[PDB]
Design a protein around this nucleic acid. Structure first.
Length: 1334
RNA sequence: UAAAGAUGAGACGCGUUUUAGAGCUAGAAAUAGCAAGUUAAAAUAAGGCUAGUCCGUUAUCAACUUGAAAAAGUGGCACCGAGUCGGUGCUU
DNA sequence: CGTGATTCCAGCGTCTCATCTTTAACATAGC
DNA sequence: GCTATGTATTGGAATCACG
């Protein structure tokens, strides 16, 4: 057997895989072809890629699910309201509800009168004349005292309930308090009365304009403060203003309180905070705060409500009616003015729904902003239009009642209006008086966020716990739903379990046991050194307890100085003690212990072990719940131990956070032999003082064995990872591909598996930085030389501006016209730390001025330019790291340790997702753990970063073009494999740095090299950074092993051949499409069969419906249809589109479903399921992917020669002046070959694309633009590559000529082609001849 | 310490559809002129049964055999070349 | 009267709460 | 070496020449 290696390149939409044997050669194997075709064996290379649509997050699905729940709950609310009115409405109008329900149906299908409200034309007309809108009805019901018809009352209540506004404000809003300035004046007067020593000059300041401005709270606060020179934003009055605005002012400083007096009116805990303030400073401020609350209410009412408050107690309805009347007046005036001045546009405005005029604004589809945009020039053109212009500038012209900005309306307004209506009308209807509370509750009822859906054990999102088996109506919500259990579950279901005990549940972060464990763990490794002690010794259990009692149980923080003084000097009488393992202060502290001591004021209660659980039950209670009512209810069980003041303090106290170790891992499990737990061992470990890591990793203790036993699905193991769903899908596909490849090679696991993951996915900032630096320095470079943001994208110009137009190495300036001859050099050479960022770059006239380029710039340059670099640093032109790198010469230069660190940086992978992937592959591939409890590393999972491979490609001219074809994924995978294998062969000792598993200074000059480069040995010629070009040995081999790792005379040629291989296994992952049934937009009624009904009885021919259904998978059916008038059973073979809506119906019984669509005598066994991207080979190598039931996609790749790819990369500058000149010469030489690329494209188009018109247009445009510069033509050809790229057709633009996408909207040809079932890797293929069917 | 993404829950405002919002005048009528325009009901993935204030757009999936289904199993090697893979040699 | 070419188009915008992760900053232990 | 501890794209539908 030939031992091989697998390289993989993971990405969002692609997974590249490659198999390499020795000499970095891709094997070519013959694979059997199943099916009924004639082929029996096909040659396939062992490199390819898998293509799939990127994974989608569940965010859209979560939004849709929440929307469905909201709609169901709204409908249930309406049903409850109707049930309240059942008997009375039935007595009044028997079929009023029935008419309301069938209002959507056409008159032909209505079972009652077409007029819903009254059931007759006359009364409906009279009502609509009396009340133009529902708001008029609401205002009338609120104000008028005469008895009204029950139907109007029901309509008003239904309109209030169905649309109730947000709940972002809790408590009572008091809409009558709408005095924007009068309340402000009263607040100022009260403050002055309380603070007569410090009056506030409120004269000359408009409270209304400043506070009701359509601006941010901070901006309006600053504007208010600016008119008060004697008051600041952080002052007591300023903090009151901030509280009124809804901010979070800090009253601790103003009232000199120790407690952080953070109060916000929006929070429901505001009242409790006010009570807390009613116990420290006094009650004299309480009315003051009340006034601020009223002021805040006015501010909230300022923007939403614009109407007088004395006229009525329904300000919302009054404001809506005022807006409606303004709309009527403005419409009348606009019509008059248009008729008077511009009669020709009148029909355009008031009759053209298709335009953005008034007709389209009302009857058609047009937003308010669109209408304003369309009408503003018209208004400007006319004369006598001033009020309309003023309103348009105010966005208050011809406004509707139902606008997009109605979401600011609090539910308190609607609740107050409903309460007023019920009070007015209860004297005429007894049931309204009897059920007023029920209706108010229905309006105000919300399901708490911690309760979740009110399911009964049939949802994967539910966690509610019930108290009785009944229906959870909003009136008995507390009696049924167990608030405590449900709230506890809501938090517990989302917390992580213990890593060592996956079944157990983690402890809260502030648990007393947790803090004790941390403190003891930190104290175990504490040593103390005195004069009389020969050797430092660990602290005994008694000593640890004494120290904890003296320091940890007496001070919030314990310092090293406190430990040395308060214990050794005080108790042990030690005048000189040195502590090891701790610096500065101790991180561990008994914060919860001291907090509880402060609150309950009973140290002995805390010190009692019997209270431990109780104490825990307190701390957990302070973490699970955020609602203070829940906290109080939970703590009521233990309210007997502590006074009511202590209970109130506990309710006020609330901290959050969770630890990472469960209680059983601390005090649950006990060692079998010793009878001690983890905590017991920590409190007394003899003299070794083994800590937690030592306790759980001790092979002489049962703890490790218990952890291993307790610690005992690939899809589930991947779904629990941390990352985007697309990357997770890529990882799963990569694992499946690896399994398939291992099965391919005769079930021989490879020696190495290299993994590289591509990636997860500024001019203004540079301008700002340059301006800040120039203003700090005060130079004149910017003033004399203007620079655009786009021009700053060039590295040379940005570096020139950063260096104040001066050389960074020599005390001299630079010229813009000389930038072409200037050089860019790295402070740390690329052969030590590969950095391409600004922090490690320098613009200099010549590199020879830097001194010894092999090392850090010479100390002479540092002595020359230290002051200049410091001045640049002070202006933020350069960073501290860059300054240190420039001044590293005086700090010992580039030491060997620095080179080792740079090698580590170049080798390690920062991202943890790659680590998780490597761990998963190591676990799956390796299952041989020896008797010594160590896994035998038969398979070496290696990890690599894209930068190294990209540098390799860009250094050895192995260029890539992303748009040419999809072979670049497979080529990247192959290069990853090659580089990983070569690196692990040449530097095996570096495995630990970049190979997952468990297995430095000696490396730098068994010394590997003196430089920090690790990929440099591939270079045939190496530059000594001083122009001393030398050569490495032709055959690179590891010195110790002697095994050849690089054959420059063969490896380069082999790589060139591999990248030039025409056949590459490019496979599109066939996947059944899923999601929404069709486009969610509702179409108006049309006489077309493409419409989809929105309901079972709603014929699309009348009510419209959806269109554009999404096809999950097509089905190739061979059957017969009633062809012609004679109903001749002609055999038919055609693709039928199975929509997502019909998927369940078809899968339940295919025969009946296919018969229902007109197909007869269906062959059950001949049914062939074709998901999206199913592959067809028609003839002459033309392959097509079945995008849908009626559309095809290009499926062939263009195997462009490597020379053309290199020329395209160089000419277009897709990403050493002599090298650049030689590259330009090659670009000119292959420009002679430019027409060959177009010829190849045309040949491929004729062979496989069959797009005659587009090809002719491309040729004509190319012939026209032959005179264009070479680089522009190269870029345009790169764009032209979109014509032949695999996947869906897409339009492109060759210079100024736009070529549209050619669509293959006929699937008749594939019916006689060869269907291909490609495996996950595509090596195992199943060709089926469809022409043999039927 | 600060910042981002993933997941879940509770809520809003719209938006979009059919109907109700008697259009009038004259003109055979088609068609011209004039009036009016803001709102409301219902639905907001068909729907399903486990009938709940439940669930219905995530994730997963080449073909064949077995396995409910999760899952398992089903396919020679070496060499010479290379237009999407061919040809040669040993066993079959 | 089928058929290739050409055109337009797709629901959206907030708010609150909780839990995880991850990235950018460090010290302390271990196996 | 590694684990813990704390600080747009594109398929559908329509429409349009159009032989």
């Amino acid at each position: 057997d030939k031992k091989y290696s697998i390289g993989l390149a993971i990405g969002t939409n692609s997974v590249g895989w490659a198999v390499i044997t020795d000499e970095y050669k891709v094997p070519s194997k013959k694979f059997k072809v199943l099916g009924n075709t004639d082929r029996h064996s096909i040659k396939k290379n062992l490199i390819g890629a898998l293509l799939f649509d990127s994974g989608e997050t569940a965010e859209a699905t979560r939004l849709k699910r929440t929307a469905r729940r909201r709609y169901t709950r709204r409908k249930n609310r309406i049903c409850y309201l109707q049930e309240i009115f059942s008997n009375e409405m039935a007595k009044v109008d028997d079929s009023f509800f029935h008419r309301l329900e069938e209002s959507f149906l056409v008159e032909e299908d209505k079972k009652h009168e077409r007029h819903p409200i009254f059931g007759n034309i006359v009364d409906e007309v009279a009502y609509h004349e009396k009340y133009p809108t529902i708001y008029h009805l609401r205002k009338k019901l609120v104000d008028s005292t005469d008895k009204a018809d029950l139907r109007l009352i029901y309509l008003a209540l239904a309109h209030m309930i169905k649309f109730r506004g947000h709940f972002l404000i809790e408590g009572d809003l008091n809409p009558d308090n709408s005095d924007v300035d009068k309340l402000f004046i009263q607040l100022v007067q009260t403050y002055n009365q309380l603070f007569e020593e410090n009056p506030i000059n409120a004269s000359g300041v408009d409270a209304k304009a400043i506070l009701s401005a359509r601006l941010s709270k901070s901006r309006r606060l600053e504007n208010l403060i600016a008119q008060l020179p004697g008051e600041k934003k952080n002052g007591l009055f300023g903090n009151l203003i901030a509280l009124s605005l809804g901010l979070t002012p800090n009253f601790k400083s103003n009232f000199d309180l120790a407690e952080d007096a953070k109060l916000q009116l929006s929070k429901d805990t505001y009242d409790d905070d006010l009570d807390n303030l009613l116990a420290q400073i006094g009650d004299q401020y309480a009315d003051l705060f009340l006034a601020a609350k009223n002021l805040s209410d006015a501010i909230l009412l300022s923007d939403i409500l614009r109407v007088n408050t004395e006229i009525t107690k329904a300000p919302l309805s009054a404001s809506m009616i005022k807006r409606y009347d303004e709309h009527h007046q403005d419409l009348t005036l606009l019509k008059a003015l248009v008729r008077q001045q511009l009669p020709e546009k009148y029909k355009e405005i008031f009759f053209d729904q298709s335009k953005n005029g008034y007709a389209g604004y009302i009857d058609g589809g047009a937003s308010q902003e669109e209408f304003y945009k369309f009408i503003k020039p018209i208004l400007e053109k006319m004369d006598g239009t001033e009020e309309l212009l003023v309103k348009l500038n105010r966005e208050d012209l011809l406004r509707k009642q139902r606008t997009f900005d109605n979401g600011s309306i609090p539910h308190q307004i609607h609740l107050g209006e409903l309460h007023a209506i019920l009070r007015r009308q209860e004297d005429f209807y007894p049931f309204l008086k009897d059920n007023r509370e029920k209706i108010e509750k229905i309006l105000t009822f919300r399901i708490p966020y911690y309760v979740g859906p009110l399911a009964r054990g049939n949802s994967r999102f539910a966690w509610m716990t019930r108290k009785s088996e009944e229906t959870i109506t909003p009136w008995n919500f507390e009696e049924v739903v167990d608030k405590g259990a449900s709230a506890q579950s809501f938090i517990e279901r989302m917390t992580n379990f213990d890593k060592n005990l996956p079944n157990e549940k983690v402890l809260p972060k502030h648990s007393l046991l947790y803090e004790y464990f941390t403190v003891y763990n930190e104290l175990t490794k504490v040593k103390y050194v005195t004069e009389g002690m020969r050797k430092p010794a660990f602290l005994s259990g008694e000593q640890k307890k004494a120290i904890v009692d003296l320091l940890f149980k007496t001070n919030r923080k314990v310092t090293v100085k406190q430990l040395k003084e308060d214990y050794f000097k005080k108790i042990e009488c030690f005048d000189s003690v040195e502590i090891s393992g701790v610096e500065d202060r101790f991180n561990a502290s008994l914060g919860t212990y001291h907090d509880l001591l402060k609150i309950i004021k009973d140290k002995d209660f805390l010190d009692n072990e019997e209270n431990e659980d109780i104490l825990e039950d307190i701390v957990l209670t302070l973490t699970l719940f955020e609602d203070r009512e829940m906290i109080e209810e939970r703590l009521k069980t233990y309210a007997h131990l502590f006074d009511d003041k202590v209970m109130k303090q506990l309710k006020r106290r609330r901290y959050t956070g969770w630890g990472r170790l469960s209680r059983k891992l601390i005090n649950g499990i006990r060692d079998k032999q010793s009878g001690k737990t983890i905590l017991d061992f920590l409190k007394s470990d003899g003299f070794a003082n083994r800590n937690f890591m030592q306790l759980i990793h001790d092979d002489s203790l049962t703890f490790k064995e218990d952890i291993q036993k307790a610690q005992v699905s690939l899809h589930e193991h991947i779904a629990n990872l941390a990352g985007s769903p697309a990357i997770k899908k890529g990882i799963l596909q990569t694992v499946k591909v690896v399994d398939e490849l291992v099965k391919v090679m005769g079930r021989h696991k490879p020696e190495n598996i290299v993994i590289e993951m591509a990636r997860e996915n500024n001019s203004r900032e540079r301008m700002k930085r340059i301006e800040e630096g120039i203003k700090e320095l005060g130079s004149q470079i910017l003033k004399e030389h203007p620079v655009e943001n786009t021009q700053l994208q060039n590295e040379k110009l940005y570096l020139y501006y950063l260096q104040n137009g001066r050389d960074m190495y020599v005390d001299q300036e630079l010229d813009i016209n000389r930038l072409s001859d200037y050089d860019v050099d790295a402070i740390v050479p690329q052969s030590f730390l590969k950095d391409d960022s600004i922090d490690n770059k320098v613009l200099t006239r010549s590199d020879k001025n830097r001194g010894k380029s092999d090392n850090v710039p010479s100390e002479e340059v540092v002595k020359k330019m230290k002051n200049y670099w410091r001045q640049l640093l002070n202006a933020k032109l350069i960073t501290q790291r860059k300054f240190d790198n420039l001044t590293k010469a005086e700090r010992g230069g580039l030491s060997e340790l620095d080179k080792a660190g740079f090698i580590k940086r170049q080798l390690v992978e920062t991202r943890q997702i790659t680590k998780h992937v490597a761990q998963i592959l190591d676990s799956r591939m390796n299952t041989k753990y020896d008797e010594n409890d160590k896994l035998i590393r038969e398979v070496k999972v290696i990890t690599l970063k894209s930068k190294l491979v990209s540098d390799f490609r860009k250094d050895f001219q192995f260029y890539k073009v992303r748009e040419i074809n999809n072979y670049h994924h497979a080529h990247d995978a192959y290069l990853n494999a090659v580089v990983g294998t070569a690196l692990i062969k040449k530097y095996p000792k570096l495995e630990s740095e970049f190979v997952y598993g468990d297995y430095v200074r000696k490396m730098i000059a068994a010394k590997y090299f003196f430089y920090s480069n690790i990929m440099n040995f591939f270079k045939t010629e190496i530059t000594l950074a001083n122009g001393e070009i030398r050569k490495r040995p032709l055959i690179e081999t590891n010195g110790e092993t002697g095994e050849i790792v690089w054959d420059k005379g063969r490896d380069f040629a082999t790589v060139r051949k591999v990248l030039s291989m025409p056949q590459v296994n490019i496979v599109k992952k066939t996947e059944v499409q899923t999601g929404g049934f069709s486009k969610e937009s509702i179409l108006p009624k049309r006489n077309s069969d493409k419409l989809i009904a929105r309901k079972k009885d709603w014929d699309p021919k009348k009510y419209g419906g959806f269109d554009s259904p999404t096809v999950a998978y097509s089905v190739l059916v061979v059957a017969k249809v009633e062809k012609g008038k004679s109903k001749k059973l002609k055999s038919v073979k055609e693709l039928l589109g199975i929509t997502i809506m019909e998927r369940s119906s078809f899968e339940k019984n295919p025969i009946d479903f296919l018969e229902a669509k007109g197909y007869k005598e269906v062959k059950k066994d001949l049914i062939i399921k074709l998901p999206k991207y199913s592959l067809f080979e028609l003839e002459n190598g033309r392959k097509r992917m079945l995008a849908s039931a009626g559309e095809l996609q290009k499926g062939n790749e263009l195997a462009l020669p490597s020379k053309y790819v290199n020329f395209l990369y160089l000419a277009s500058h897709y990403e050493s002046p002599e090298d650049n000149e030689q590259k330009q010469l090659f670009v000119e030489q292959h420009k002679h070959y430019l027409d060959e690329i177009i010829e190849q494209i045309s040949e491929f188009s004729k062979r496989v694309i069959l797009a005659d018109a587009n090809l002719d247009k491309v040729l004509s445009a190319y012939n026209k633009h032959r005179d264009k510069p070479i680089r522009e033509q190269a870029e345009n050809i790169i764009h032209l590559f979109t014509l032949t790229n695999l996947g869906a057709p897409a339009a492109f633009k060759y210079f100024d000529t736009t070529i549209d996408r050619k669509r293959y909207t006929s699937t008749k040809e594939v019916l006689d082609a060869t269907l291909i079932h490609q495996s996950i890797t595509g090596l195992y293929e199943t060709r089926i001849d469809l022409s043999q069917l039927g």
